[PDB]
Amino acid sequence: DERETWSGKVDFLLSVIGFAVDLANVWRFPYLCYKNGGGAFLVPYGIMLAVGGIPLFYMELALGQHNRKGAITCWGRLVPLFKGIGYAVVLIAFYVGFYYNVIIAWSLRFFFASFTNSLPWTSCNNIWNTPNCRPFEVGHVEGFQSAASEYFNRYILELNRSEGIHDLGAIKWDMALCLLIVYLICYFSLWKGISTSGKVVWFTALFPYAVLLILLIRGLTLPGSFLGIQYYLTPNFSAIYKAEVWVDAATQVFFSLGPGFGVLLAYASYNKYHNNVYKDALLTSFINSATSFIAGFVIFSVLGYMAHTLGVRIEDVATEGPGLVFVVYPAAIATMPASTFWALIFFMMLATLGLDSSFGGMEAIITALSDEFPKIKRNRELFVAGLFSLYFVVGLASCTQGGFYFFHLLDRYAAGYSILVAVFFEAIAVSWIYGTNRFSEDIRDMIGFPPGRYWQVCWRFVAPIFLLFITVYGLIGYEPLTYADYVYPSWANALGWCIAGSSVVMIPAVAIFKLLSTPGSLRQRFTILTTPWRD
């Protein structure tokens, strides 16, 4: 009955804001708008965000605060038949932690390499360079990289020394040190729990916005900056016709708000019962999407600068993922005056963008396991020590020469499209089995008023329909995993499916398990599993 709460109201907000706002905001959303025809993409993004994204974001924060327990125990007390959901959601966050923290490590590694006036990714005359090295951005592919590309590929990653995922090669110990530093930072933040964790996010969540503002001014102060904003927000509305633009908006809206990781469930579990979640859900949702929209200008203002002064096609300078932040953007930074300054804050922003996001992922596992196993709660300092040790040791695979191939595998299979089916079951379990009326009755007792029928319609009908169908059309367009000119072996693709499925299969797994464990008639055993804690 006695459970610790955030030492302040802002601790929870910045913790959720920090977790919600990640590299994905800078990476994809700006790029998505470019490919999808600008502000016209806001429509499918906004539509899917409104019906699908927010209501589910609202649902977890509501469920977390009301049931006052971790992700696993929360679904156990809600729908004991579906308690497998709590396991599926948590071990997904367990997988992500493996491949995600390396991004923060790359941020630090570039940050460490960022002390000099002469940036190593500027010209082609170094040793790691090849005769095919070009100044900025030819193509590509194929065969001719850039100074920023070859520096990242042939030195930092040294992926050129690996022939695929089957050969990891030697372990880079400068990355191992960086990865260690990353897990160390994650460790002392979650060391004492949300006590320290609450006031740590005051930096990691807020800091990126400081650098965002600086790079926004510096970005729009450059020649051809307005030209990049054109490729960004230019409103071609014919893009709404395509089927993939809706699944991207959906998958982006879901991955951006981060429901289904059990993080919102954990974070909200430390909230006070009568605290207003609906207000926090709305505010947090906006700040995240707003940060993306803002970041869109920051990227393309610089991208436009390259397509004017640097003499390159905007086609080749527009990219998502680590390629943008670790290659293209630094390439543009290297040319402009006081380059060493922009590089430092940029990479530091990348690290502070991933850290507070990783915090939620870790806390989702810790809080979920702590409520399930009291032996962990008292020993928590020792528990999180071993967990991160597992992450680091296994994460050493990410620090190998072929480490990126390992990264791209989890970036693909580890968590995606499972969150959809995982969140799909969350909505159905709440709206149907547990019921909407009983859930709205809970929110009434908490914030003082029941959710508008608009929210109830999304939970019961819209979300599951806009999930189940979009999650299906993603399976139709499925490509066997390939990176660049490299094509992953058939066995590698299978290993990823096990990872993606190991969670989702927990739904029927614990369902059938607890179903045959309970003494009684089949229909009675069903009723036993559909009843909440005191009900």
């Binding site: 082609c124 005359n125 005769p131 095919n132 070009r134 030819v138 193509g139 590509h140 065969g143 001719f144 003499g311």
Partner: protein, 219 residues
């Protein structure tokens, strides 16, 4: 039978203008449409323009449109491309091809002529000998070298002993770094041959009118 030879081309400064010619023989020239295809230093093929058999139908790429003018002379069997306001991205090797039947593609291409557009200016290459470290290595084979450094523009002609021995010779392609080309070469031969015989590095850079033949002394 059919033969196509591209002429002209060379170093031009940005904004400058130049025209290239293509000599045609072995077929009736007025009966075939011709086109200009260029290949960048990154080795990607890009179609430039196409002229009809009578020259009454012209097509250009959006890149070179209005800057380049493709002409035709059916009397002397010559194909022309007249450029203007050239830019650094116009640098490539231009090919003359036909081009008559759209369903069968281009069935004949020429040797090609190279066009280089840069603000840089011609400079003669400096050839240096590569002599192995004193004493030390004794083996069945030995490797010499010739370093051609700081020249522009391409190409250069490097041969060993006037092209006597082409076996065991690796001539590395030049690499442009800050408006300067650097080209080296390696030659491996038996220790009984050298230095019991004369081994020289022949380098030719017609652009600067530079002809340099130099032997490799163990000194």
């Amino acid at each position: 039978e059919v033969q196509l030879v591209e002429s002209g081309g060379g170093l031009v400064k940005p904004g400058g203008s130049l025209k290239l010619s293509c000599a045609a023989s072995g077929f009736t020239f007025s009966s075939y449409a011709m086109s200009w295809v260029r290949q960048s230093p990154e080795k990607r093929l890009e179609w430039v323009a196409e002229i009809s058999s009578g020259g009454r139908y012209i097509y250009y790429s959006d890149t070179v449109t209005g800057r380049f003018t493709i002409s035709r002379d059916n009397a002397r069997n010559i194909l022309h491309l007249e450029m203007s306001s050239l830019r650094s991205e116009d640098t490539a090797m231009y090919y003359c091809a036909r081009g008559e039947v759209r369903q069968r593609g281009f069935d004949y291409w020429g040797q090609g002529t190279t066009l280089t557009v840069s603000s840089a200016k011609t400079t003669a290459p400096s050839v240096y000998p590569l002599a192995p470290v004193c004493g030390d290595t004794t083996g069945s084979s030995v490797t010499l070298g010739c370093l051609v450094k700081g020249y522009f523009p391409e190409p250069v002609t490097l041969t060993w002993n006037s092209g006597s021995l082409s076996s065991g010779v690796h001539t590395f392609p030049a690499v442009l770094q800050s408006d300067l080309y650097t080209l080296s070469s390696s030659v491996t031969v038996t220790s009984s041959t050298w230095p019991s015989q004369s081994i020289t590095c022949n380098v030719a850079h017609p652009a600067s009118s530079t002809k340099v033949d130099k032997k490799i002394e163990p000194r």
